[PDB]
Amino acid sequence: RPTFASVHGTEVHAGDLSLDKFIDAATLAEAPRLPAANTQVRTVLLTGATGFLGRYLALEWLERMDLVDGKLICLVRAKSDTEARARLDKTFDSGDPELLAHYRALAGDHLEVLAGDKGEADLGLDRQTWQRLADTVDLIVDPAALVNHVLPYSQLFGPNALGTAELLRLALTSKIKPYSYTSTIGVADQIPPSAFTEDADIRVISATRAVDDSYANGYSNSKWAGEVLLREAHDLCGLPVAVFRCDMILADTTWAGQLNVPDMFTRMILSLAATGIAPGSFYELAARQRAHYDGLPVEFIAEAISTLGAQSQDGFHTYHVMNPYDDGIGLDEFVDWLNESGCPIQRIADYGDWLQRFETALRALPDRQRHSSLLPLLHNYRQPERPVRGSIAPTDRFRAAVQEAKIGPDKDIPHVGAPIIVKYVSDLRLLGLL
Numbered sequence: 001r002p003t004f005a006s007v008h009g010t011e012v013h014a015g016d017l018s019l020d021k022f023i024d025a026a027t028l029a030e031a032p033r034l035p036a037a038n039t040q041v042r043t044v045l046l047t048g049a050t051g052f053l054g055r056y057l058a059l060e061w062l063e064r065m066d067l068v069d070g071k072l073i074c075l076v077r078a079k080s081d082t083e084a085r086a087r088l089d090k091t092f093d094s095g096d097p098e099l100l101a102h103y104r105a106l107a108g109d110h111l112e113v114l115a116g117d118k119g120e121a122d123l124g125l126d127r128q129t130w131q132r133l134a135d136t137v138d139l140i141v142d143p144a145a146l147v148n149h150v151l152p153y154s155q156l157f158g159p160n161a162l163g164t165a166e167l168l169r170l171a172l173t174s175k176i177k178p179y180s181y182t183s184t185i186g187v188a189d190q191i192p193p194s195a196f197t198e199d200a201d202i203r204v205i206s207a208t209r210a211v212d213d214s215y216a217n218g219y220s221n222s223k224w225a226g227e228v229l230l231r232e233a234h235d236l237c238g239l240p241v242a243v244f245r246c247d248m249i250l251a252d253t254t255w256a257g258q259l260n261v262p263d264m265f266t267r268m269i270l271s272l273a274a275t276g277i278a279p280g281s282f283y284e285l286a287a288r289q290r291a292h293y294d295g296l297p298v299e300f301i302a303e304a305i306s307t308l309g310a311q312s313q314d315g316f317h318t319y320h321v322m323n324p325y326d327d328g329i330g331l332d333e334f335v336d337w338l339n340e341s342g343c344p345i346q347r348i349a350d351y352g353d354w355l356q357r358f359e360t361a362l363r364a365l366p367d368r369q370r371h372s373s374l375l376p377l378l379h380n381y382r383q384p385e386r387p388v389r390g391s392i393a394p395t396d397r398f399r400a401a402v403q404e405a406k407i408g409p410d411k412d413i414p415h416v417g418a419p420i421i422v423k424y425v426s427d428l429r430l431l432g433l434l
């Protein structure tokens with residue numbers, strides 16, 4: 001198997017990630033001469049459907065396949081196909097009867113679940129099944145990743161970089177398949193701000209990257225590696241690619257009991273509500289300064305990835321799925337909205353004093369809350385954040401495409417509002433965390 005050592009073995013280079021380190025010579029020689037998959041999509045392969053974004057993508061693609069009597073195939077980690085299907089059923093059994101009925105209605109005719117693993121040869125599938133996917137899949141939608149902001153690139157390489165290369169083997173066999181990929185705004189950690197754009201080739205703007213133990217270094221490197229591999233594949237055979245670099249993915253209001261419990265935003269809301277104390281400001285003071293939180297609700301993101309993804313046109317397109325507005329809606333407003341919805345929060349004016357008292361209050365929480373709180377991430381809040389008026393990244397290509405496709409209720413990128421924050425509270429209560 002390809003490994004971090006065989007490919008990269010303190011700094012890594014985009015040039016390290018040639019497809020010949022992952023895929024056999026014959027597959028690569030043949031890829032330029034293969035036909036494209038049919039542009040009328042009737043079979044979709046979705047990874048990560050048990051994940052937070054992935055389950056919303058599963059709903060999108062079940063709905064889209066219902067219109068054309070098609071099939072959604074979900075790759076799910078499990079010891080058997082039976083267990084895999086049970087895991088995905090359980091994902092949609094969250095205390096919302098309408099969600100469960102909607103999923104069950106669509107899944108009966110349009111869902112296949114396969115046990116497998118992106119990091120394994122042939123995605124962990126037997127040769128007959130793998131060949132069937134190679135022959136039939138019209139689109140790959142790939143949000144699956146090990147999302148962990150502490151592990152090194154050496155440990156995330158398997159699921160996130162090699163995993164991309166394994167899906168590319170499938171995309172480059174029998175017929176060339178469009179590939180929709182989720183990356184992260186975090187790749188910008190090592191890129192000059194003026195060069196970090198939707199138009200750029202990631203190999204040009206991020207040719208060399210450092211490997212170290214800083215926050216999310218490994219994860220952001222691993223997501224960069226996927227983008228680089230996709231660029232290599234596009235050079236070889238022109239496969240359509242859509243890369244969606246996402247900001248923080250927020251919970252959304254349609255379905256009850258659907259939260260990304262381990263993510264840092266959920267941990268923050270739970271921690272504020274449970275301790276009842278917030279800082280005067282989460283941001284550097286001037287007075288409290290105008291600030292913007294760069295997050296988008298998941299139903300919007302799933303719809304945009306689906307509508308604007310690689311099946312929708314030819315070429316290689318990168319989109320910054322970010323919230324660009326200078327709207328003054330930041331973390332301090334979220335505290336105010338928590339307070340206004342019956343989750344009382346007292347402000348401690350001095351940030352340092354707040355942080356010390358907050359740590360003490362977190363340790364006093366009962367186990368279930370404490371384990372899902374900000375306690376393990378407090379190190380990241382040692383200094384207040386510098387406020388930004390909009391996003392750190394440009395969004396012109398994404399915003400134009402969202403407007404042109406008339407996506408969502410705003411026919412535009414949405415703003416965050418109080419109902420999003422209130423949904424965190426009502427879901428945390430439903431899940432027994434408040």
Ligand SMILES: NC(=O)c1ccc[n+]([C@@H]2O[C@H](COP(=O)([O-])OP(=O)(O)OC[C@H]3O[C@@H](n4cnc5c(N)ncnc54)[C@H](OP(=O)(O)O)[C@@H]3O)[C@@H](O)[C@H]2O)c1
Nearest residue numbers: 048050051052053077117118143144145146159246248249
């Ligand atoms: N959430 C965010 O704020 C955020 C921000 C920027 C980018 N993103 C990107 O958005 C995508 C989805 O994020 P998420 O928050 O939905 O993550 P998540 O909830 O942790 O879901 C991860 C999914 O990937 C699957 N997976 C992990 N390793 C795998 C492997 N070796 N083989 C097959 N499947 C594997 C997981 O399966 P199990 O259920 O078996 O673990 C799960 O279904 C990721 O690509 C992430 O980098 C997310």
